[PDB]
Design a protein around this nucleic acid. Structure first.
Ligand SMILES: [Mg+2]
Ligand SMILES: [Mg+2]
Ligand SMILES: [Mg+2]
Ligand SMILES: [Mg+2]
Ligand SMILES: [Mg+2]
Ligand SMILES: [Mg+2]
Ligand SMILES: [Mg+2]
Ligand SMILES: [Mg+2]
Ligand SMILES: [Mg+2]
Ligand SMILES: [Zn+2]
Lengths: 97, 86, 107, 96, 45, 122, 63, 136, 116, 99
RNA sequence: CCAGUUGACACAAAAUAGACUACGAAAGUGGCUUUAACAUAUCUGAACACACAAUAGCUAAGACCCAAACUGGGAUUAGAUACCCCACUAUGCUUAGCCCUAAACCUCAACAGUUCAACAAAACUGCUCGCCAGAACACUACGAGCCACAGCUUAAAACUCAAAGGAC
């Protein structure tokens, strides 16, 4: 049990601040049937499919750069007084290394 | 019988493509509501009924916009299962 | 019955229109405004003639003078274009408020 | 003290979200400029959200447009072919 | 300052140096702001 | 508020229009109307005429007479304008160039509906 | 946090976050994170002007 | 490419489409409705020549408003116009009904080339008030 | 996006005039519009009409309307095929987009949480 | 509503919970679960989100507890006398892994 | 005078923007120039008075191509002052002698505030006047007020009963 203030201050999710146009690198947390849900900390992980340019290096423990765009994805529809979450992020993929 | 009618709602046709100009005119009538204008001015509708119909049209437009937004927002999941464990 | 042609109440401390031609002063005198100018004239005159602390429009006596000026303005407005019932009801409510304020004062 | 969450002055503030009239008052004495916001066939104006303006903004804009149409500062029935193309000010809903 | 600005602008209205000539120019000459605009603040005809 | 006149007439000779404009300016200066600028929108003319009632205006000019009236003279000015002959659609205007639209900065986000029906099922 | 203004200035004056961030292991470090840490170390104790040190660090990292 | 606005002969014609100005291209006034049509093909010199109906074929009931009678009348008018020379025309439409697109297709198939649909439908811009509701 | 409806509400708050008067329960759902077809179509009859016209202009048999007779045959065939293709694609199983039930399930994946 | 006391703050539509409260809750819950397993306390796991059902089931296998990461049919705990035996000790502790 | 390109006579009617936000105690409104435009900002305090008219109507009339109350002639018609086709008379725009009733509903009063019989416009208390605690008779006979003389504010008492009403 160390200092609670410093630990709450210096943290990855808090150090990255408001994720917006930030190239983040990470690995895949779980192989998908035919997708490519690559993780990278933050609050959620991106969602996409395997790219045509080099789509084999993606392994459980790799390092591929992302873009991080909208880590919330929510919108009050019609009468839903609350929000409708999707647990996604959706970001433009760059490549490998 | 008042002004030059060759310029009022006179869409040009290119290469005899009357279908394109006709489709543009129909889209104009629909969006702007000129067909609706004719249908509503041809005969009378109670001002109470008119306001109720306007409110119903606003409600229908809101419903259609929300449906389109929900479709465009949830079409992102058109992929596959994430885990497939339970 | 305040005077018709006078000087501006707000533009009183401006010597840049006193020693000038006619149109320059007219642009900043009683000509381009409306009945509000006559209302301000009446307010200033009655405040200088009655209360010892003019230019206020907030205190008790100032509020009463403002209400009286508003009633006079509504009367003068109804003097012309009598085909307006909304303004008639406005004047009726103004007279009711005048009665209420006078009663509260006397009591 | 400093390592605790303290509400600051709320950074990441975008400037005045201006729509199109950032600082250029459109003139109501022209053909091309006044017809840009009007259809060159029936004299119709585009929606409020289509132009991206606010409430009072687009309200006064369309009021001035109708004033120009009526008083005689712009042709309402149509537009002269002299002023051909029009910049993409209001997202045209037809033809495209 | 506003009164001084108005006094200075009064000379820019219809001074005696441009009375009949001004009417002649208005009846013959041109002086319009015929300029189109786009989504942004750009000048174009 | 301020005023603004846009005298729309035809291209009828020239000395007659000049004399009429001179007379109008002299009358406005002698009465109590301050004239701002006497600009002009060229020889522009709408491609379509007017549904007149009681004339036929094809080609005409746009002689502006940016003037400012006090209060008890708008009717007299309208009468003096109607006293003319060739007029498309005489209609005084209120100077909108100086002060733009009302006080409004930019766009604001539209609020969402918060609880419009009872929480049950329906 | 106090680093909000620092990040805002860093991303407004210069480009957005272009460095690859891991964010898996705790208190990870890279280049932009190292710059933020250096800024926090140089803050406060400035008073005069922090833009000077900001531009100095930016030019040292870029050239 | 190709301006959408029609250059009227006054303000302003500048090209010669197949050696024919805008005024040289006559009009094709048609009364499009659910009942019948009154075609009118003008000449190059601004003179009417053609005029076909629907009941003349043999029908007299609501069958005249169908597309068959409209197309036949359009073909007859196109033939009457070509008898003296017209070729180009300006399609017109007045009202709504099955004879709207059918008349245009008939005019197109009658050998006449269309270049500008100068349709002038009856759109009373805030004029005649509405009448009592009736089953249309 | 949506029209103004803050003050214009028939509630105890703002005593303004209500604008939106929804006769139906304005509550989102997870079901696409109703499926429908066949009511007052009577389409694809121009070929048959021109064939009948050509036959009436001549006599009864096919002598100068071979083009019209083959057009009528092709029109009947294509009309049957088009009715079938409509009832299939335009109603239920499509080929290019998603199906009605598929879209309904996709919307149901994330319904709503109105009870907070 | 009852989650506001725990939710300390937020980071742009992202709630943050105090670490001390979560640590104390974890300590208490783990102590209770351990002292319950000290008497064969049948612990029951639940996780229908499919996020980590595999790992939860593997951990339950490695230990002596059980999991209910599948559909809840006609009463699995309130009506466990028909679908199962009559004398069956029901779970005395349920650790909702993903409620 | 049917389809109009070169034009034509109404106290009409607000084509998309009207998807906009307002005042008025509430009626009430949207294509334009001008006169005058938003009362007190502590609340309430007359259904024995000053005024509005929602829409309509009696009397004196002006008056808009454009609408119907009186309408004729014909699908259907067994029996149709409506339905399916033409327009028209009191009236829609204007000044006066007038009942001011409504679904003048947003059936939810103004201020101080705080956090579910069922249908649901969420719950909890103070302040001011109004309401009733048998229906049909009883938006009525009769009485009081109105220049209404078919009505308006109030508007009761007899024989019948287990009531009656609303929701689920
Ligand atoms: Mg309903
Ligand atoms: Mg009270
Ligand atoms: Mg009282
Ligand atoms: Mg009334
Ligand atoms: Mg009538
Ligand atoms: Mg009549
Ligand atoms: Mg009117
Ligand atoms: Mg009453
Ligand atoms: Mg009512
Ligand atoms: Zn703007």
């Amino acid at each position: 049990v160390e200092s609670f203030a410093s630990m709450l201050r210096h943290s990855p999710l808090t150090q990255m601040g408001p994720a917006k146009d930030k190239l983040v690198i990470g690995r895949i947390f779980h192989i998908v049937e035919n997708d490519l849900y690559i993780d990278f900390g933050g609050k959620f992980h991106c969602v996409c499919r395997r790219p045509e340019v080099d789509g084999e290096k993606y392994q459980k423990g790799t390092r591929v750069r992302l873009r991080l765009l909208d880590l919330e994805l929510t919108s009050r529809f019609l009468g839903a007084t609350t929000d409708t979450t999707v647990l996604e992020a959706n970001a433009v993929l760059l490549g490998i290394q | 019988a008042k002004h030059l009618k060759f310029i009022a709602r006179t869409v040009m046709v290119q290469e005899g493509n009357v279908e394109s100009a006709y489709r543009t005119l129909n889209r104009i009538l629909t969006m702007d509501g000129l067909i609706e204008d004719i249908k509503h001015r041809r005969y009378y509708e109670k001002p109470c009924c008119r306001r109720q119909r306007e409110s119903y049209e606003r409600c229908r437009r809101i419903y259609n916009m929300e449906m389109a937004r929900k479709i465009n927002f949830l079409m992102r999941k058109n992929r596959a299962d994430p885990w497939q464990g339970c | 019955d305040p005077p018709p042609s006078t000087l501006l109440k707000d533009y009183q401390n401006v010597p840049g229109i006193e020693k000038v031609d006619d149109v320059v002063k007219r642009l900043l005198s009683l000509e381009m405004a409306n009945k509000k100018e006559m209302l301000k004239i009446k307010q200033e005159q009655f405040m200088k003639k009655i209360v010892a602390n003019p230019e206020d429009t907030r205190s008790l006596e100032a509020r009463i003078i403002a209400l009286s000026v508003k009633i006079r303005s509504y009367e003068e407005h109804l003097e012309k274009h009598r085909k307006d019932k909304a303004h008639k009801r406005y004047l009726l409510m103004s007279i009711d408020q005048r009665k209420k304020m006078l009663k509260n004062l006397r009591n | 003290n400093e390592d605790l969450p303290i509400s600051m002055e709320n950074p990441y503030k975008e400037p005045l979200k201006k729509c199109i009239l950032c600082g250029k008052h459109v003139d109501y004495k022209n053909v091309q400029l006044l017809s840009q916001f009007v259809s060159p066939f029936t004299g119709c104006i585009y929606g409020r959200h289509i132009t991206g303006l606010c409430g009072k903004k687009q309200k006064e804009i369309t009021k001035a447009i109708k004033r120009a149409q009526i008083m005689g500062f712009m042709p309402v029935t149509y537009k002269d072919p002299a002023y051909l193309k029009d910049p993409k000010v209001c997202n045209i809903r037809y033809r495209e | 300052r506003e009164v001084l600005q108005l006094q200075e602008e009064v000379k820019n209205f219809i001074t005696r140096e441009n009375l009949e000539a001004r009417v002649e120019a208005a009846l013959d000459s041109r002086k319009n702001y015929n300029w189109a605009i786009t989504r942004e603040g750009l000048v174009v005809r | 508020p301020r005023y603004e006149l846009a005298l729309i007439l035809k291209a009828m000779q020239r000395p007659e229009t000049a004399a009429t404009l001179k007379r109008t300016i002299e009358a406005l200066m002698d009465r109590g109307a301050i004239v701002r600028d006497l600009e002009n929108l060229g020889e522009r003319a709408l491609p379509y005429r007017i549904s007149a009632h009681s004339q036929q205006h094809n080609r005409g000019g746009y002689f502006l007479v940016d003037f400012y009236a006090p209060t008890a003279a708008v009717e007299s000015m309208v009468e003096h304008l109607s006293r003319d002959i060739d007029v498309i659609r005489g209609n005084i205007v209120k100077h909108p160039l100086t002060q733009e639209l009302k006080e409004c900065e930019g766009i604001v986000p539209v609020p969402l509906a918060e609880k419009l029906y009872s929480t049950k099922k329906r | 946090y106090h680093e909000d203004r620092i990040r805002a200035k860093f991303y407004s004056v210069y480009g957005s976050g272009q460095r690859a961030f891991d964010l898996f292991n705790p208190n990870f470090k890279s280049t932009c994170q190292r710059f933020v840490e250096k800024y926090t170390e140089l803050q406060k104790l400035g008073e005069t002007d922090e833009e000077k040190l900001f531009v100095e660090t930016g030019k040292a990292l870029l050239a | 490419k190709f301006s959408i606005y029609p250059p009227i002969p006054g303000e302003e014609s500048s090209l010669r489409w197949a050696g024919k100005k805008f005024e040289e291209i006559p009009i094709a006034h048609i009364k499009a409705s659910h009942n019948n049509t009154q075609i009118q093909v003008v000449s190059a010199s601004n003179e009417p020549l053609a005029f076909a109906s629907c009941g003349t074929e043999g029908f007299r009931n609501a069958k005249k408003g169908t597309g068959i009678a409209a197309q036949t009348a359009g073909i007859a008018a196109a033939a009457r116009a070509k008898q003296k020379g017209v070729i180009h025309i300006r399609v017109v439409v007045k009202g709504l009904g099955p004879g709207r697109l059918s008349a245009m297709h008939g005019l197109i198939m009658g050998g006449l080339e269309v270049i500008s649909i100068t349709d002038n439908t009856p759109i009373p811009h805030n004029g005649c008030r509405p009448r009592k509701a009736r089953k249309l | 996006a949506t029209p103004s409806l803050r003050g214009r509400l028939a509630r105890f708050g703002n005593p303004r005039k209500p604008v939106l008067k929804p006769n139906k329960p304005l509550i989102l759902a997870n079901r696409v519009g109703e499926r429908r077809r066949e009511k007052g179509e009577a389409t694809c009859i121009t070929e048959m009409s021109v064939m009948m016209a050509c036959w009436k202009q001549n006599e009864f048999r096919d002598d100068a309307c071979r083009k019209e007779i083959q057009g009528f045959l092709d029109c009947a065939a294509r009309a049957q095929e088009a009715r079938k293709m409509r009832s299939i694609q335009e109603t239920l199983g499509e080929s290019g987009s998603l199906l009605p039930n598929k879209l309904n399930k996709l919307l149901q994946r994330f319904p709503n949480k109105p009870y907070l | 509503r009852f989650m506001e006391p725990y939710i300390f703050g937020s980071r742009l539509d992202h709630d943050i919970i105090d670490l001390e409260q979560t640590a104390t809750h974890l300590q208490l819950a783990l102590n209770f679960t351990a002292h319950m397993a000290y008497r064969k306390g049948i612990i029951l796991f639940i996780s229908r989100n499919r996020q980590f059902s595999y790992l939860i089931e593997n951990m339950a296998r490695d230990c002596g507890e059980y999991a209910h990461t599948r559909y809840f049919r006609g009463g699995m705990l309130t009506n466990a006398r028909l679908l199962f035996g009559p004398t069956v000790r029901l779970p005395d502790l349920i650790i909702f892994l993903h409620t």
